[PDB]
RNA sequence: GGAAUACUGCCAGCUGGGACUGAGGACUGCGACGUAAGUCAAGGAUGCUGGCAUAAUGGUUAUAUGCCGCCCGUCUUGAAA
RNA sequence: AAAUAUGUAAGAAGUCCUUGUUACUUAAUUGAACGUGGACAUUUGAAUGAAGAGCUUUUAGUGGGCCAUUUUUGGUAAGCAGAACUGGCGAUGCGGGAUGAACCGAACGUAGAGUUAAGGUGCCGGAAUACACGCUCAUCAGACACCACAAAAGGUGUUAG
RNA sequence: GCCCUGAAAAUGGAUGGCGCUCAAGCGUGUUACCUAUACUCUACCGUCAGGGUUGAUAUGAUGCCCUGACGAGUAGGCAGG
RNA sequence: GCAGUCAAGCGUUCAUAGCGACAUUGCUUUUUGAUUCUUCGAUGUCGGCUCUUCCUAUCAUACCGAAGCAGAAUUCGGUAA
RNA sequence: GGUUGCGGCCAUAUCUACCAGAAAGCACCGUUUCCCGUCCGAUCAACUGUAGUUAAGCUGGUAAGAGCCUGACCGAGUAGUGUAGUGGGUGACCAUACGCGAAACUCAGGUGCUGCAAUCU
């Protein structure tokens, strides 16, 4: 906040660091999808409509999001959203099984080797990204969101968010969506 | 709906009990499903599986295959296990002492093994002596020895063996077997 | 009675049902087609190195 | 009738480069090829002997043999639903060491060394490649740089 | 495309070897949110300079609020727009209380009269007309007379209930 | 010049109305409130009260009413044809 | 000379040090193959995923296909003939397009509560005869993708330019 | 731009119908609302997977038990009845 | 088969009263073809006779507009089946 | 730095015209007994390094030179193209969204670099 105020004061422009994290929601059904984006949709663990996952933004994931774009709607999650998403809908993957994160014991049992021995340890490793994001985030089952309570705000979903809504990078706006899907 | 990546409701390709109805066999099986469940000891978990196998997957361990396996260094005092039956081999003369746990022994096999001053015990007899497989030396027979597998992979240039009911010259020996009759395989 | 002549329609789908993989690599692979006289002499370097390493067992 | 001869369809593939015809220079004969070497294939149409078939044009494989005037390359060819393994006998004029393979080895050496210097201080390394990260914050200054502000341009024909 | 907003969008080519600190460019953009604003920056910046956003960055986004939002004024609007058969330049006047208002009705108008959707319209320049009677188009000029007043004949009151027990009057 | 307010976002802020569900069946887990005894909304509903007896309730059947439903079998790219 | 497609590589079957074998090879204890002994196991050498990997045997049905976007050959053309990649129909109901193989949405165990999609909300018909700025009057108006057609040409209608 | 002319076919008929003219038409924007066998939570059936459990302890060890996921189907294969 | 746009020409003179070349936009499905979707366990295959009804691109009849309409005769066009 | 022998890459090295080049080298050049080849000692072969000369080869310099090479917000984000929509249009076709992106043009710079060995005012 104050970095921006100071650069302004000095007649410059503070420019933020590009976002290290995105959350992704598949908003397309499963049939009539072309092989390539279809494949990508799976490797991002997004194989049913309205499921979601977090992605670390680097060049090599950035081009996945490109390839997959008219099927998903994504952006940058707030702490608030990441917190409610894991609390309400966070399940862990253990011996192939999908287990709810009812107690902190469950996470430590599995992520303890990496640090991470509470749910907010998990959240932290997600929003800050870094060290064991791979593992912590993979530990999280894809989130099974509902349809948005209050609608999609748009006449038709399968245009770009810029074109008249849904699909593509809606940036910050992702949060309002996911909050009605959560 | 779910874009499946995997066949749903697929069962493991693995036997889970023996196919047999042999009362006694289901008891051995009942033994080691306990031993393998309630111990670690890799050995039990193996025999428990080996019990489910079919007669092809349990080819005979020979008496000489045992005699040789004992020539291994630090072997001679181990007790060789054969979850299957042990046959006799006329071709070794010197046959050592040692105690052999199997499922079945042919007449001549426990003959050899005993007369050499050695023992022939059933598996559950083994189970009590060695609940954790102590000094056991598991042995498996030559699977790929069957007459059946000679024909597997039969094809041009595959070098395999035709399914020919009655052999000789005049029996699939001409065109396609020699450069002089059409060509060669 | 003319009938359809050709296509590769579906043939990809078919190939990818249980297909592609690659084709199985092996340290110590098939000396099929490798230069005979190189091989011949290689048989003898091999006999030697082994025979030589017998000079440590006795 | 249809025609499917051995060099069919290769009017431009086996063509010489523009103003690069005639004599193949002597660098091509001085290069040395070992087994396990990784080579690109690219036929020289003036060297009609030991050409690759047109399929293998642009494919890259491993040397399994070094004969007098040729190498044997192993190519994995897709046929049906499985990869099949192919033995090729190419004269040296149709072969080329792979650059990306030579860069790999350089990075192996580079990796050994970085590892030396690091361990010769017991310190950590990170020897493996990370992909292009986001971007940290910046502060652009406005001195000498008061934003020229642009706008869209009207339509205008000119024929 | 909704409730419009005006944005100062500022960006520059990414820094390099030879040009540490390149030149900043600014646009004013009527879009309905930031994500569109920044995208419409890069749209034009491709067409004017030859930057692609892959090789550039967005230094600042600022919302330009209207100075005197409760002062009625006369805006002149310059427009480039695409038709079913050609692409043309326009000038029109819009009387309103804010820049953002002016644009909304511009965009509506282009759409009613010439069937021009948002995509087929570049906004060239929008500028308050300081000196009255620089006002060029009549449909505005007729509101600029001294002591302007008009009636609003035939007034149709919307009914709540479906039956009414009196024959209505249109009598404003 | 000093304020408000809109817009946007956050609260592990408080709170009213309506709806569907109540799987499980000794204990065991993680907790919370307590100075403690002890209490609790903490690994799935209990309490209080009323109604029904030639009846409440339910199954079946007939009919009516709202919406929906072409003839099976076959060959076929395609059948109510 | 693009775009899109397309080969290979990103290490333990690896790296370095010492020096052993041979009949091959070198002017040559030179090489080339293959090894002994020693050293390096934190990121062992990009990302993401892995619902487990590998593998063997045997056998059914099929071997008339058709459709859509795009590429595209023949033809004046065709609901015509013929190829290309993918997705469909065929084998598949369900919600939408009144109607309908193939479009849009979405794929199906028996159910409850919620939210939606594509598509709709005057009445038939569940759902604003909602809000807002314009445009249009047709003695042949018009009314929504696929789709159930319209052209050269023209108007002192009217609107904006 | 919209409208008018250019604009001719055979039973009587089709923006789906009625009907609609500051629309119930055309272009655009903003909200709310209706609705799938899809999405979210829950029960139950089955299938598959992973575990636990006869140490002596009334009547099912191919059984009991805990947990997770999944369910379209012609020709056709197999299994259980 | 039928109808347009252009206007070089024809028409004593005069493009368009009536025509209209070189080109070019269309419409029609009583021509002929192209295709092979429907019917090969069967839709009786030309002409005429008889009778009804429909289309209009109107031959006559009604009322008009036009002319290279003096009159008579005619020709072009409209509303008209 | 010059030069020569053997080269690498193979025009920034080629082409046209005109100047210049010390020293060494290279060359042209002298000769026909011998080996050797020609219609022809021209080429090829041998002999001398002796009679001669930088005239040419060669080497550099010159040129709003031809070609070639490099670059550029020069054209141009043009043409073309991957993906998206129940986008526009009667249609040919077009625009928008996430991306890639030329050629012709214009202008600016350049005109061999380099390895082994011998040698030189
Ligand atoms: Mg609400
Ligand atoms: Mg609601
Ligand atoms: Mg909106
Ligand atoms: Mg919700
Ligand atoms: Mg035999
Ligand atoms: Mg053989
Ligand atoms: Mg035929
Ligand atoms: Mg056909
Ligand atoms: Mg066929
Ligand atoms: Mg041909
Ligand atoms: Mg060719
Ligand atoms: Mg090339
Ligand atoms: Mg030859
Ligand atoms: Mg245009
Ligand atoms: Mg435009
Ligand atoms: Mg709150
Ligand atoms: Mg209960
Ligand atoms: Mg009753
Ligand atoms: Mg019905
Ligand atoms: Mg029937
Ligand atoms: Mg048929
Ligand atoms: Mg039928
Ligand atoms: Mg590939
Ligand atoms: Mg088969
Ligand atoms: Mg078969
Ligand atoms: Mg067959
Ligand atoms: Mg395609
Ligand atoms: Mg399709
Ligand atoms: Mg069929
Ligand atoms: Mg379907
Ligand atoms: Mg329709
Ligand atoms: Mg689509
Ligand atoms: Mg809609
Ligand atoms: Mg009705
Ligand atoms: Mg209603
Ligand atoms: Mg009128
Ligand atoms: Mg359209
Ligand atoms: Mg007009
Ligand atoms: Mg007519
Ligand atoms: Mg109509
Ligand atoms: Mg229209
Ligand atoms: Mg409207
Ligand atoms: Mg719209
Ligand atoms: Mg609207
Ligand atoms: Mg259901
Ligand atoms: Mg089923
Ligand atoms: Mg005249
Ligand atoms: Mg004339
Ligand atoms: Mg005439
Ligand atoms: Mg026919
Ligand atoms: Mg019939
Ligand atoms: Mg009949
Ligand atoms: Mg008859
Ligand atoms: Mg008429
Ligand atoms: Mg008239
Ligand atoms: Mg006259
Ligand atoms: Mg007369
Ligand atoms: Mg007369
Ligand atoms: Mg007359
Ligand atoms: Mg006429
Ligand atoms: Mg009549
Ligand atoms: Mg002579
Ligand atoms: Mg001479
Ligand atoms: Mg000579
Ligand atoms: Mg020279
Ligand atoms: Mg020049
Ligand atoms: Mg264009
Ligand atoms: Mg394109
Ligand atoms: Mg759609
Ligand atoms: Mg249309
Ligand atoms: Mg285009």
Swiss-Prot record, chain A:
| UniProt KW keywords | Cytoplasm, Ribonucleoprotein, Ribosomal protein
One example of the protein's molecular function in GO is: structural constituent of ribosome
Gene Ontology biological process terms in this record: cytoplasmic translation; maturation of LSU-rRNA; maturation of LSU-rRNA from tricistronic rRNA transcript (SSU-rRNA, 5.8S rRNA, LSU-rRNA); ribosomal large subunit biogenesis
Reply yes or no: does the keyword Cytoplasm apply: yes
Q: Which residues form a coiled coil?
A: none
Q: Name one GO cellular component term.
A: cytoplasm
Key word Zinc present: no
Q: Which family does it belong to?
A: Belongs to the universal ribosomal protein uL30 family.
What is this protein's function?
Component of the ribosome, a large ribonucleoprotein complex responsible for the synthesis of proteins in the cell. The small ribosomal subunit (SSU) binds messenger RNAs (mRNAs) and translates the encoded message by selecting cognate aminoacyl-transfer RNA (tRNA) molecules. The large subunit (LSU) contains the ribosomal catalytic site termed the peptidyl transferase center (PTC), which catalyzes the formation of peptide bonds, thereby polymerizing the amino acids delivered by tRNAs into a polypeptide chain.
Q: How does it assemble?
A: Component of the large ribosomal subunit (LSU). Mature yeast ribosomes consist of a small (40S) and a large (60S) subunit. The 40S small subunit contains 1 molecule of ribosomal RNA (18S rRNA) and 33 different proteins (encoded by 57 genes). The large 60S subunit contains 3 rRNA molecules (25S, 5.8S and 5S rRNA) and 46 different proteins (encoded by 81 genes).
Q: What is this protein called?
A: Large ribosomal subunit protein uL30A
Q: Which gene encodes it?
A: RPL7A
From Swiss-Prot, chain B:
Q: Which Pfam families match?
A: Ribosomal_L18 (PF17135)
Indicate where this protein is primarily found: cytoplasm
In terms of superkingdom, the source organism counts as: Eukaryota
GO CC terms: cytosol; cytosolic large ribosomal subunit
- Localisation per UniProt entry: Cytoplasm
Task: Mark the residues carrying the PTM N6,N6,N6-trimethyllysine.
Answer: 49
Q: Which GO terms describe its molecular function?
A: RNA binding; structural constituent of ribosome
- BP-aspect Gene Ontology terms: cytoplasmic translation
Key words of the record: Cytoplasm, Isopeptide bond, Methylation, Ribonucleoprotein, Ribosomal protein, Ubl conjugation
- The covalently linked position for Glycyl lysine isopeptide (Lys-Gly) (interchain with G-Cter in ubiquitin), per the record, is 115
Q: Keyword check for Cytoplasm, yes or no.
A: yes
The record's subunit annotation is:
Component of the large ribosomal subunit (LSU). Mature yeast ribosomes consist of a small (40S) and a large (60S) subunit. The 40S small subunit contains 1 molecule of ribosomal RNA (18S rRNA) and 33 different proteins (encoded by 57 genes). The large 60S subunit contains 3 rRNA molecules (25S, 5.8S and 5S rRNA) and 46 different proteins (encoded by 81 genes). eL18 interacts with NAP1.
> What PANTHER family does the annotation carry?
60S RIBOSOMAL PROTEIN L18, LARGE RIBOSOMAL SUBUNIT PROTEIN EL18
Q: What is this protein called?
A: Large ribosomal subunit protein eL18A
Q: Which gene encodes it?
A: RPL18A
From Swiss-Prot, chain C:
Q: Name one GO cellular component term.
A: cytoplasm
Keyword field contains Nucleotide-binding: no
Could you tell me one molecular function GO term of this UniProt entry?
Answer: structural constituent of ribosome
UniProt keywords (A-Z) are: Cytoplasm, Isopeptide bond, Ribonucleoprotein, Ribosomal protein, Ubl conjugation
Q: Which InterPro entries match?
A: Ribosomal_eL29
Q: Where is this cross-link: Glycyl lysine isopeptide (Lys-Gly) (interchain with G-Cter in ubiquitin)?
A: 51
Q: Where in the cell is it found?
A: Cytoplasm
The GO biological-process annotations, alphabetized, read as: cytoplasmic translation
Q: A Pfam family in this protein? A: Ribosomal_L29e
Ribonucleoprotein as a keyword? yes
- Specify residue ranges for compositional bias: Basic residues: 1-25
Sequence segments annotated as region (Disordered): 1-36
- Its biological function? Component of the ribosome, a large ribonucleoprotein complex responsible for the synthesis of proteins in the cell. The small ribosomal subunit (SSU) binds messenger RNAs (mRNAs) and translates the encoded message by selecting cognate aminoacyl-transfer RNA (tRNA) molecules. The large subunit (LSU) contains the ribosomal catalytic site termed the peptidyl transferase center (PTC), which catalyzes the formation of peptide bonds, thereby polymerizing the amino acids delivered by tRNAs into a polypeptide chain.
Q: State the family it belongs to.
A: Belongs to the eukaryotic ribosomal protein eL29 family.
Q: What else is known?
A: Present with 51100 molecules/cell in log phase SD medium.
Q: How does it assemble?
A: Component of the large ribosomal subunit (LSU). Mature yeast ribosomes consist of a small (40S) and a large (60S) subunit. The 40S small subunit contains 1 molecule of ribosomal RNA (18S rRNA) and 33 different proteins (encoded by 57 genes). The large 60S subunit contains 3 rRNA molecules (25S, 5.8S and 5S rRNA) and 46 different proteins (encoded by 81 genes).
This chain belongs to the protein called Large ribosomal subunit protein eL29
**What is the name of the gene encoding this protein?**
RPL29
Curated annotation (Swiss-Prot), chain D:
Please give the Pfam families that the UniProt record associates with this protein: Ribosomal_L21e
A biological process (GO) annotation for this entry? cytoplasmic translation
Quick one: where is this thing mainly located? Answer: cytoplasm
Localization recorded for this chain is: Cytoplasm
Annotated crosslink Glycyl lysine isopeptide (Lys-Gly) (interchain with G-Cter in ubiquitin) location: 31
State the signal peptide span.
Answer: none
Tagged with keyword Metal-binding: no
Classify the source by domain of life: Eukaryota
* InterPro entries referenced in this protein's UniProt entry, alphabetically: Ribosomal_eL21 (IPR001147), Ribosomal_eL21_CS (IPR018259), Ribosomal_eL21_sf (IPR036948), Translation_prot_SH3-like_sf (IPR008991)
What UniProt keywords apply to this chain's record, in alphabetical order? Cytoplasm, Isopeptide bond, Ribonucleoprotein, Ribosomal protein, Ubl conjugation
As one GO molecular function, the record gives: structural constituent of ribosome
Per the record, GO CC terms? cytosol; cytosolic large ribosomal subunit
Additional remark text = There are 2 genes for eL21 in yeast.
According to its UniProt entry, the function of this protein is described as: Component of the ribosome, a large ribonucleoprotein complex responsible for the synthesis of proteins in the cell. The small ribosomal subunit (SSU) binds messenger RNAs (mRNAs) and translates the encoded message by selecting cognate aminoacyl-transfer RNA (tRNA) molecules. The large subunit (LSU) contains the ribosomal catalytic site termed the peptidyl transferase center (PTC), which catalyzes the formation of peptide bonds, thereby polymerizing the amino acids delivered by tRNAs into a polypeptide chain.
What family does this chain come from, according to its entry?
Belongs to the eukaryotic ribosomal protein eL21 family.
Q: What is the name listed in the Swiss-Prot or TrEMBL entry for this protein? A: Large ribosomal subunit protein eL21A
Q: Which organism is it from?
A: Saccharomyces cerevisiae (strain ATCC 204508 / S288c)
């Amino acid at each position: 906040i104050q970095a921006k105020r100071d650069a302004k004061a000095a007649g410059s422009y503070y420019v933020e660091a590009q976002h290290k994290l995105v959350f992704v929601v598949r908003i397309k059904g499963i049939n009539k999808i072309p092989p390539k984006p279809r494949k990508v949709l799976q490797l991002l663990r997004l194989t049913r409509i309205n499921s979601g996952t977090f992605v670390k933004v680097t060049k090599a994931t950035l081009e996945l999001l490109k390839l997959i774009e008219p099927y998903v709607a994504y952006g940058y999650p707030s702490y608030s959203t990441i917190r409610q998403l894991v609390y309400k809908r966070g399940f862990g993957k253990i011996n192939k099984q999908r287990v709810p994160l009812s107690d902190n014991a469950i996470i430590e049992a599995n992520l303890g080797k990496y640090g991470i021995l509470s749910i907010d340890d998990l959240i932290h490793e997600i929003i800050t990204v870094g060290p064991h994001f791979k593992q912590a985030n993979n530990f999280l089952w894809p989130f099974k969101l509902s349809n948005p309570s209050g609608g999609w705000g748009v006449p038709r979903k399968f245009k770009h968010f810029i074109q008249g809504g849904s699909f593509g990078n809606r940036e910050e706006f992702i949060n309002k969506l996911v909050k009605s899907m959560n | 709906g779910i874009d499946h990546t995997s066949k749903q409701h697929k069962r493991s390709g693995h036997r889970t009990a023996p196919k047999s109805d042999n009362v006694y066999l289901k008891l051995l099986v009942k033994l080691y499903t306990f031993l393998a469940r309630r111990t670690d000891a890799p050995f039990n978990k193996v025999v428990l599986k080996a019990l489910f196998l079919s007669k092809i997957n349990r080819p005979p361990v020979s008496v000489s295959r045992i005699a040789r396996a004992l020539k291994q260094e630090g072997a001679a005092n181990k007790t060789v296990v054969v979850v299957g039956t042990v046959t006799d081999d006329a071709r070794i003369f010197e046959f050592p002492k040692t105690t052999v746990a199997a499922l079945r022994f042919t007449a001549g096999a426990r003959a050899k093994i005993v007369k050499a001053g050695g023992e022939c015990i059933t598996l559950d007899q083994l189970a009590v002596r060695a609940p954790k497989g102590q000094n056991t030396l598991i042995l498996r027979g030559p699977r790929n020895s069957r007459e059946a597998v000679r024909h597997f992979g039969m094809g041009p240039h595959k070098g395999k063996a035709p399914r020919i009911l009655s052999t000789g010259r005049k029996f699939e020996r001409a065109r396609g077997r020699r450069r002089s009759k059409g060509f060669k395989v | 009675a003319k009938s359809k002549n050709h296509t590769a329609h579906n043939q990809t789908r078919k190939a990818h049902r249980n297909g592609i993989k690659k084709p199985k690599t092996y340290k110590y692979p098939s000396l099929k087609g490798v230069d005979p006289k190189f091989r011949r002499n290689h048989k003898h370097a091999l006999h030697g190195t082994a025979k030589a390493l017998a000079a440590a067992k006795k | 009738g249809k025609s499917h001869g051995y060099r069919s369809r290769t009017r431009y593939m086996f063509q010489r480069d523009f103003r690069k015809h005639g004599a193949v220079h002597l660098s091509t004969y001085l290069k040395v090829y070992k087994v396990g070497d990784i080579v690109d294939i690219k036929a020289n149409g003036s060297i009609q002997k030991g050409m690759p078939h047109k399929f293998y044009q642009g494919k890259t494989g491993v040397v399994y043999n070094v004969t007098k005037s040729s190498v044997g390359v192993i190519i994995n060819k897709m046929v049906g639903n499985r990869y099949l393994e192919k033995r090729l006998n190419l004269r040296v004029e149709h072969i080329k060491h792979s650059k990306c393979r030579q860069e790999f080895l350089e990075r192996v050496k580079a990796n050994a060394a970085k590892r030396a210097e690091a361990k010769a201080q017991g310190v950590a390394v990170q020897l493996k490649r990370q992909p292009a990260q986001p971007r940290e914050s910046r502060i652009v200054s406005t001195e000498g740089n008061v934003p020229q502000t642009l706008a869209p341009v009207p339509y205008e024909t000119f024929i | 495309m909704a409730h419009f907003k005006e944005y100062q969008v500022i960006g520059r080519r990414l820094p390099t070897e030879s040009v540490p600190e390149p030149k900043l460019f600014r646009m004013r953009i009527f879009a309905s949110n930031e994500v569109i604003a920044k995208s419409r920056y890069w749209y034009f910046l491709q067409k004017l300079h030859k930057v692609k956003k892959a090789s550039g960055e967005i230094v600042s986004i600022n919302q330009i609020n209207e100075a005197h939002p409760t002062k009625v004024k006369n805006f002149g609007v310059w427009v480039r727009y695409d038709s079913r058969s050609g692409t043309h330049n326009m000038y029109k006047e819009i009387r309103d209380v804010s820049r953002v208002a002016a644009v909304e009705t511009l965009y509506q108008d282009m759409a009613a009269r010439h069937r021009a959707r948002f995509r087929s319209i570049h906004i060239l320049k929008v500028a308050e007309i300081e000196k009255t009677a620089d006002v060029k188009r009549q449909y505005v000029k007729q509101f600029l007379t001294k002591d302007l007043k008009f009636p609003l004949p035939h007034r149709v009151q919307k009914s709540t209930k479906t039956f009414s027990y009196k024959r209505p009057s249109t009598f404003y």
